[PDB]
Structures are given as structure tokens and as C-alpha cells.
Design a protein around this motif. Sequence first.
Motif, mmCIF file in Angstrom:
data_model
loop_
_atom_site.group_PDB
_atom_site.id
_atom_site.type_symbol
_atom_site.label_atom_id
_atom_site.label_comp_id
_atom_site.label_asym_id
_atom_site.label_seq_id
_atom_site.Cartn_x
_atom_site.Cartn_y
_atom_site.Cartn_z
ATOM 1 N N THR A 76 0.821 -1.200 0.000
ATOM 2 C CA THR A 76 0.000 0.000 0.000
ATOM 3 C C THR A 76 0.859 1.255 0.000
ATOM 4 O O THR A 76 2.002 1.247 0.461
ATOM 5 N N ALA A 77 0.289 2.338 -0.516
ATOM 6 C CA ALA A 77 0.955 3.628 -0.552
ATOM 7 C C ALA A 77 0.735 4.349 0.773
ATOM 8 O O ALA A 77 0.269 3.762 1.752
ATOM 9 N N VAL A 78 1.062 5.636 0.825
ATOM 10 C CA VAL A 78 1.045 6.405 2.065
ATOM 11 C C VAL A 78 -0.152 7.352 2.128
ATOM 12 O O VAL A 78 -1.000 7.233 3.014
ATOM 13 N N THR A 79 -0.221 8.316 1.208
ATOM 14 C CA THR A 79 -1.284 9.318 1.095
ATOM 15 C C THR A 79 -1.296 10.301 2.261
ATOM 16 O O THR A 79 -2.034 11.290 2.231
ATOM 17 N N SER A 80 -0.482 10.056 3.279
ATOM 18 C CA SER A 80 -0.443 10.917 4.460
ATOM 19 C C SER A 80 0.724 11.896 4.374
ATOM 20 O O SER A 80 1.593 11.947 5.238
ATOM 21 N N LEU A 81 0.735 12.685 3.310
ATOM 22 C CA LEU A 81 1.788 13.666 3.114
ATOM 23 C C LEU A 81 1.340 14.996 3.697
ATOM 24 O O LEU A 81 0.211 15.434 3.461
ATOM 25 N N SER A 82 2.215 15.627 4.467
ATOM 26 C CA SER A 82 1.892 16.864 5.153
ATOM 27 C C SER A 82 2.878 17.946 4.755
ATOM 28 O O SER A 82 3.998 17.667 4.327
ATOM 29 N N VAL A 83 2.450 19.194 4.906
ATOM 30 C CA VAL A 83 3.250 20.351 4.536
ATOM 31 C C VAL A 83 3.632 21.103 5.799
ATOM 32 O O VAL A 83 2.793 21.318 6.681
ATOM 33 N N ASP A 84 4.900 21.482 5.895
ATOM 34 C CA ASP A 84 5.370 22.248 7.036
ATOM 35 C C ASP A 84 4.827 23.670 6.981
ATOM 36 O O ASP A 84 4.636 24.243 5.909
ATOM 37 N N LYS A 85 4.570 24.238 8.159
ATOM 38 C CA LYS A 85 3.999 25.579 8.226
ATOM 39 C C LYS A 85 4.940 26.619 7.638
ATOM 40 O O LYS A 85 4.522 27.472 6.850
ATOM 41 N N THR A 86 6.214 26.572 8.014
ATOM 42 C CA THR A 86 7.135 27.643 7.654
ATOM 43 C C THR A 86 7.844 27.374 6.332
ATOM 44 O O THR A 86 7.705 28.144 5.380
ATOM 45 N N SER A 87 8.608 26.286 6.259
ATOM 46 C CA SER A 87 9.346 26.004 5.034
ATOM 47 C C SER A 87 8.422 25.541 3.920
ATOM 48 O O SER A 87 8.699 25.791 2.744
ATOM 49 N N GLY A 88 7.336 24.861 4.265
ATOM 50 C CA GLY A 88 6.385 24.406 3.283
ATOM 51 C C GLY A 88 6.736 23.114 2.588
ATOM 52 O O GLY A 88 5.951 22.652 1.754
ATOM 53 N N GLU A 89 7.876 22.506 2.902
ATOM 54 C CA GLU A 89 8.258 21.287 2.214
ATOM 55 C C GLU A 89 7.498 20.092 2.781
ATOM 56 O O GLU A 89 6.746 20.201 3.750
#
Lengths: 110, 117, 56, 39
Positions: free
Chosen positions: C22-35
Motif C-alpha cells: 500500500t501507498a502512504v497518502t499521508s503527506l503533510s506540509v510544514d507551516k514555515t518552510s512548506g516542504e
Amino acid sequence: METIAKHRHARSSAQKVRLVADLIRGKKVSQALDILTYTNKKAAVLVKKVLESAIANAEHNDGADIDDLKVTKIFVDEGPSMKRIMPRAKGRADRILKRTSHITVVVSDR
Amino acid sequence: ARVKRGVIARARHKKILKQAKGYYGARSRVYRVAFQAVIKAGQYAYRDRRQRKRQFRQLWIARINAAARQNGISYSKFINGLKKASVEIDRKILADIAVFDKVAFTALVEKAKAALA
Amino acid sequence: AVQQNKPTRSKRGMRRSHDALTAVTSLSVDKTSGEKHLRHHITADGYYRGRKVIAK
Amino acid sequence: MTANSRSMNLSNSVAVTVYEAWRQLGYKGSWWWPRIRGP
RNA sequence: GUAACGGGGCUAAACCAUGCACCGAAGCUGCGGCAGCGACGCUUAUGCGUUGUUGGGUAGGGGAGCGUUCUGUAAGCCUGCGAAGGUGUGCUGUGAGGCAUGCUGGAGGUAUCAGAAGUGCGAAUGCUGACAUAAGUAACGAUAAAGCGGGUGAAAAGCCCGCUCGCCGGAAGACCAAGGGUUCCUGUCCAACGUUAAUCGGGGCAGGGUGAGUCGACCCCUAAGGCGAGGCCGAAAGGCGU
RNA sequence: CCCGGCGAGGGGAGUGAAAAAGAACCUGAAACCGUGUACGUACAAGCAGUGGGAGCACGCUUAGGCGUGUGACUGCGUACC
RNA sequence: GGUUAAGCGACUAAGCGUACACGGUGGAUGCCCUGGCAGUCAGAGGCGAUGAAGGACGUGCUAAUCUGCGAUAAGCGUCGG
């Protein structure tokens, strides 16, 4: 239009590699590049290198706009197998196969 | 005067395999099993050519018996009455009439009933 | 103990019906850097929940 | 040049070992347990 | 595990007597076709017509054929207007089979009538090569043990520095003769080998390294034993011996 | 010339009648393993076929239906030497 | 038009089967030949104490494996083509 890149004689069995290739069948390029980075398998490195190389081809030889490319077809197949000898108990001996694979990715703007 | 057996054997093998399309599993990929499958199939076809002529008569008898009892007469009495009136209609034709023309079937039935008298 | 008759290529496929991953799909973005990063993990440049962290 | 030469020549060799590995005396001594339907 | 009607079920759907209907086989009849063996007529051979009867088959006997490589017919015929081979399709013989054509293929192939056979494969716990199954299963070779920081690097649990911890210490320490033959040192490389990775190596490649009057061989002397001029024996070869 | 580790393997450009003749290099079969398309399959019991037979999809067609593929349901049926 | 009932019921594929199209692996088949097999017709039927058959180590501009050669070492003198 279509663009292809191939990795021939990759040092890994065909069955193991195919598990990775199922994930990215039919996705967009950006999503595929994301998924392959966060999956912990040896094969994921090879497939990612091949996919990146294919991306590069479709921009420099053919046209442009990498922002709407998709993975259209991808498949794996067996290659030549090296054979080696490994000893066992009581003097008997056994055969060993070190299988390889061929890797192809079809990227297109359709 | 040495002779090699390549082309002849290859053609002979290809001949059998092409006769086994649609067979499950190895029964359509390997010669040693396809051969036996085809020989069986031939035997079954030869045997079934005789059975086909029995199933249809079975069906016709059933349909005639069904249609006759609608008009208050049994199949056996109906058939006996037909011959006492010297009527020679094939059972297949009788079944077809029963399906596709009820008036004609009644016209036959009343005549047979009168022939028995 | 050994097999008496070799299993078909169908039974081999049926057993492997649970081997898909299975894949992840739980990708999140950092508040400041945004990566990008996983949940509850530090991003590549050392940025957790916006506030800078070790970042060696 | 250590690509197609070394790989395939090494692969060649293994055959003789499997063939000469069988020359071992596989007598098992005998069947050590009592006979199946002895006297 | 019902189970001493095949079941369901049955006071007739049971058992005697009588009768008439119908079902039921590759048997008989009908229609169409093939092959024998006789009879009878025409051609009086073949070619025919009109009849009667026959055709389950192991061991085995008799009669007919198909196809493959090679020789003559051949300096003949077919061949870039595309040969053998490979791969589909369509026709037609009772069969082994034949013919035409699409695509690959890129240089040889054989009417017809005769001749000669290394002349036809599913099996012989048959022989050689290739590929499967069990299966991404069992295993990764002593239960002496590792933790962290820095460095190089595309990538560090395994490499290099540093600290701490643990093990052996009549050995898991330091030498010699056998045996091995460059495995020794330096610099470079990581595709095979290392039971994982590897920047590392007894791995690949290129350079370098082994200095004797006193150590060891060689040399002088003989033990067990070997060879042995003459010699004594023995079909030959040879045996024993000063 | 481009992606990559100053890798291996690729995609272009170029030579050649032909590179699907690219050095594992004339031709290139079978077992074996894949991607795509069409139909069937999750209340169903057995040498997996054969005889019937709806439905679906594609092609032709002037109706009328033919041709190719698949095959729900049902009768019979215990491999070869 | 709605609200209740009762009856019937397209649409799923984790995977699997068949057919067709396109591939990979492997190296059969066809076509080749300075390699063999079986012979006719001639020649010669021995070499060696002037050191043989068979070998070791050497020999090039570069270091070796083949082919030659021998400290005069991929060669020296003379007579012909």
C-alpha cells in the motif's frame, strides 16, 4: 507523444520489482515521484532513477510541459540468469540462480 | 543419405495443437496432453451423434403430451387415434404445430377423438 | 512431505492475492518552510511543526 | 572489460562441479533402521 | 451416518387373473453416399450399365498408398515482379496429405517418370541442453557483545580516527621445519567473487620488495636400504649378489 | 548533445540497402513469464470434454440474418502406455 | 401526485479462465564452409655416438601467447629464380 527509457539487466528478481511498479500505474508524474521517495524497498530506487531519466528524455528530445505528463505503461520482464554453486551437507551440491530484470516506463502527455 | 526430422515433426505437432484451442490449462499448451484430449473429443463426438437423435424425440414427446392434455386427452390415446384415422404427421411437425398454431392442433385433436369414437 | 501434483499457475496467483503493498497518502506540509514530510517526523531540512529544530 | 567475460566464464565452470560433485559415493552405508517386513 | 425399495413418497404407486394402448437400442424399415465378391447384358479388355449379397476385431497373414534426404531426366524449368525457413487465413481429398494467399525472411529451389535409404517417436527409473513447481518458503556456519562523536563518500551498523565497554592470555600470544608459491608493501577500481550493503579485502589492474667466509643446503662420513663390473642361476623378460 | 555516481544501462543525432544487422551482433521456433483489449466468474461439488443453448461484444448486410470471440443453464460422461 | 405494502431485479473483481494483439527468455530450423570419412593413381618405405624421437629455458622496439630460430638465436655466406 510517447517517450521511453529502459534499464536493462537490472540486478534484481522480476517478482520483487513488480510489487513496486503496481503503485504508480496510471498516475501523474509528480504524484509518482512523491510515492517512490517514501517507500522503503530496494527496487524503489531503481524505478525512480528510470522514471526520472524518462522525464528528462521527454523534455530535451521531444517537446515540453512536464506539468501534465502521465505514466501510461510500465512493465517488467526477466533477463538472463547467472548460475552458481553452493555446497551442502554430506558432499552434495546445489544450483543457485541470480535472476535479473528489464525495466521500461512509458511516459506521455495524454 | 542421412535425414533430419525437424520440419516434419514440427508441422505434425502444430497440426494437433491447433485442434485444441479453448481447452483449459495444459490441455492446450503441451502435446502429450493435447493429443489425449483430442482423441477423447473425437470419441465423444462420435458417440453423441447417436444421442442427438434421441433427445429431440424425447422433447417432442413431452411437448405433444403437454399440448394434448390441454384439450382433455392423453398422449397415448391421441397417438392411437391418429393412426386409426390414417394420419401420418411427423412428431416434429406435431410439436411445431402445437407451439405455433393452437387452432390447428385442436382441429387434429377433435378428429382423433372422433376416430377413437 | 512433498507435493504429489504440481500446483497450477492459477493457484499460485490466488495465493499471491494478498502480497500487494500500500501507498502512504499521508503527506503533510510544514507551516514555515512548506516542504513535504511524513506526519510526526522531521522534514529533510530539520523543521518540525514550523519551529526550527536541530537541522545539522 | 570485467563485464561479459568474467561473468559468463565463471557461470560456465559451475557445471563441472555439479557433475563431479555427484561422483561422491552415495552409499548411505545401508538403511540403518530395521527392515520393513523382516524375517 | 438414515441405509436389507436408488430416492421422494405409496393403501394402491402392493400381489394374483384378463385386455387393449403407448415408451423403449448403433436391431428392422425410409432417403443419400463409399468399398468389395459374384451373376447378367453392351465395349463383349479397360469403359460401362441391371441385379444379389457382404463390410465389429487382439496375436497374425494378404493387398493397396502418403511424406522426407540423395542420384538421372538438368547449361532444363522457377527465382528482387522476392527462394528455402518461420508465422496466420481460405479452399479440397476417405487418410497419411495437397493447393493459393497476407506478414516476416534476404538467396537459393525443384515439375514428371525411374533409382538408393542413417526414411517418420510419447513412453525404454532412455541421452544432451533449456525452463518450471514446492516459494520469495528453510536458511545466512559456534549465545565472546557492543554504544556514541567526528571524517571521507552518490549512499555508512560493518571502512578510517577517538572514548568507553566485553573476550583470550601453557593461547584466540611470539618463532621454526614441512606444505603452499607473490597471497608481502604502496596507489588506484567496485559491474563478477565476499552467504546482506561496502568507500573495504587474501578480489581486478599498475608499480616496488627478498643483499651472507660464520644461519641452511651443497660439501666430508657412514645406518636401515638401493644399485651393482666381473660372478652364480634362469624358456625370453630377468633373480641374487663380490 | 541529454538523465546518471567523471558509473552501468538508456533516449536523440549520425554511418549503412537494412541497427527490430550495435559487437551476448544471419534467420530466429517450443516449453516458461508479462502488458493491453473483449466476454465469463464470489449459494457453488468430481478425467474439465462433447451434444443442446439464452445473453453480450465486433464485422458485413438492403430486408433477413449471416461470420468471429465468449458462454450463463441442461443431458451423457471414472486419463494414456 | 404522494404514502404505504407485496413481487421481481441491471450495475462490484481482491483475483482467476479463454481468445486476440504486442513483448521478454532460449536457441531449435533453414542456408554456409580453408574440418573430417572412405578410397583410386604414383612416391618413399626409416631416423641415431657427426648425438635421434621428445622436451626445458631463452631469442623482437614494447612483454607475453602462437610460428620460426639457438648466445652468429623471427636469423649469417654462396649460386640461381
